[PDB]
Amino acid sequence: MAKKVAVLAVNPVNGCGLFQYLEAFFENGISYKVFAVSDTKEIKTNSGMVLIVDDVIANLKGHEDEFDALVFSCGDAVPVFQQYANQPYNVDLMEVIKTFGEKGKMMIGHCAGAMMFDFTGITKGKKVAVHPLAKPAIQNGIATDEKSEIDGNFFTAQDENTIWTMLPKVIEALK
Amino acid sequence: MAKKVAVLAVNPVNGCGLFQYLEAFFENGISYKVFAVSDTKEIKTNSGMVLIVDDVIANLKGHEDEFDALVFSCGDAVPVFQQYANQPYNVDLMEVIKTFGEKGKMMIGHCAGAMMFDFTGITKGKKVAVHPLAKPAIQNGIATDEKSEIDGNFFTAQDENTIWTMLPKVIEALK
Ligand SMILES: Cc1cc2nc3c(=O)[nH]c(=O)nc-3n(C[C@H](O)[C@H](O)[C@H](O)CO)c2cc1C
Ligand SMILES: [Zn+2]
Ligand SMILES: [Zn+2]
C-alpha cells in the first residue's frame, strides 16, 4: 500500500520546481528516489548549484514496477533537448516515460513536462498543462491555458510558478 | 554599481525556500554567491539532497562590503540551533548579519530568518514577518502575522511558502 515516487531531474534542472516536489514529499512522509537524466548523479541547477542526486536514469530502466508515480522536473536541459536527442540519457528518458505511462502510473510534471510526455503518446485524449512556448508541440494530448491540469493520472503544471495549484492534490493522492 | 547578493544557506536548508531566491536571481541577471552556514562547502537539504554551494560563511567575513544584499535561507538547522549555538559557523552567522546591518544592506530572509535578524538587534523598530512558532522570539523587532513584511531595507517572509508575496519586490530592488 506504501507508495513510491521516481523523480526525474534533468541537467541542468530548475531547482525551484524540483525542491517544491521533494520538500513537499519529505514533510508529508512520501518516499521518493531522485534519478538524474545524465550519465552521472552529479548534476547542476539552472542557478548553478551543484546537486548530487540518488541515481542515474539508466538504473531506472527495468525498475518501473517498484514505483507508483513519476515526476519530471523541467530545466534548461529541455531547450537544448533536440541537440542532445540521441544522447544515452535522453533515450532512456523517453523509454522510462513510455513504460510508466503504460503501467498506468501517476504521471507528474511541469513546464515542458507535458511535452516530454506527449512525445511518447501517453497523453492521448488527456487534459495537460504546459508552458506557452511548448504548447504547439502538444499533438496527442489536449493542451489548455490553465495553470495546472488533472486528468486521469496526469498531473501537470504550466511551469514551476504554478505548481502550487496542483501540488496539494498530488500530495493527498500519494500519502 | 553592480548589485551583488550574499546568500546564506543553513545545514540542512529548506531546498524550496533557497532555490526560490537563486532561480529568481538567475532569470533576472542578478549576481549572487551562496555561502554555507556550516563547517564545509558541501551541505544537504531538508529533503536529503546533497548540495554543493559556492563557499563557506567564514570566507564572507571582512567581505561584507562586497555585497549589497544578505539572504537567509531557513531550514531544519534552526530547530537545532540552540544546541549548536556555540559552533564556529553559527558564531560567524551572527557576526555577518550584524555587519550587513551596519552598512544598511538589503536584509532578506524567511521562516526563522527574522528571528536570526532579531538576535542581533538590527530589526529594532522594524516590522518583520516571521514563522508563527518563532514569533514570541522577537524582542527588538515588530513581528506581525502577515505573510511578508517590507520595512526600510528589511524583506522578511512568514515561511518558504509565502516568499512569492515579496519576491517580485526583492527582484525589482535588485534590478
Ligand atoms: C511555493 C509557492 C507557493 C505559492 N503560493 C501562491 C498562492 O498561494 N497564491 C498565489 O496567487 N500564487 C502563489 N504562488 C505563485 C506566485 O503568486 C507567482 O509565481 C509570483 O509570486 C507572482 O506572479 C506560489 C509560488 C510558489 C513557488
Ligand atoms: Zn522548463
Ligand atoms: Zn525554518
Side-chain angles (χ1 to χ4, degrees), chain A residues 5-7 18-34 69 71 106 108 167 170-171 174-175, chain B residues 47:
Chain A
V5 181
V7 175
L18 174 60
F19 287 97
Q20 273 181 85
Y21 300 113
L22 302 190
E23 295 291 342
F25 292 157
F26 172 72
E27 291 175 22
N28 292 279
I30 301 178
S31 184
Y32 60 93
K33 184 174 177 182
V34 183
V71 176
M106 182 180 180
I108 317 171
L167 187 54
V170 168
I171 293 177
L174 293 174
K175 185 177 183 179
Chain B
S47 55

Side-chain angles (χ1 to χ4, degrees), chain A residues 24-158:
Chain A
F25 292 157
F26 172 72
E27 291 175 22
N28 292 279
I30 301 178
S31 184
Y32 60 93
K33 184 174 177 182
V34 183
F35 296 85
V37 196
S38 191
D39 55 329
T40 56
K41 57 179 178 180
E42 176 182 338
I43 67 179
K44 296 181 182 178
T45 58
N46 303 341
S47 51
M49 302 297 101
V50 173
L51 197 64
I52 303 179
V53 301
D54 299 327
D55 209 339
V56 295
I57 190 56
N59 295 329
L60 184 50
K61 300 172 59 182
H63 302 85
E64 295 81 6
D65 297 329
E66 299 184 6
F67 299 92
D68 301 90
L70 189 65
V71 176
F72 180 87
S73 291
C74 194
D76 285 342
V78 186
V80 293
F81 177 85
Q82 294 295 339
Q83 299 181 0
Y84 304 100
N86 291 91
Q87 286 290 327
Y89 45 86
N90 281 329
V91 176
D92 297 335
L93 175 59
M94 296 312 195
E95 189 163 328
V96 164
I97 289 180
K98 187 172 192 303
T99 307
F100 269 88
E102 291 176 345
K103 300 291 182 178
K105 304 295 180 177
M106 182 180 180
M107 308 304 294
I108 317 171
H110 68 275
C111 193
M115 181 186 62
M116 306 305 294
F117 294 162
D118 192 274
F119 277 168
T120 290
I122 59 177
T123 55
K124 184 177 182 178
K126 305 298 168 57
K127 292 143 51 65
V128 292
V130 73
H131 195 276
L133 291 174
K135 185 178 182 180
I138 307 300
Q139 306 287 355
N140 305 284
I142 318 174
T144 74
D145 307 286
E146 301 301 308
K147 286 180 167 58
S148 61
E149 287 287 354
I150 299 183
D151 190 25
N153 47 19
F154 283 92
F155 298 73
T156 59
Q158 190 178 224

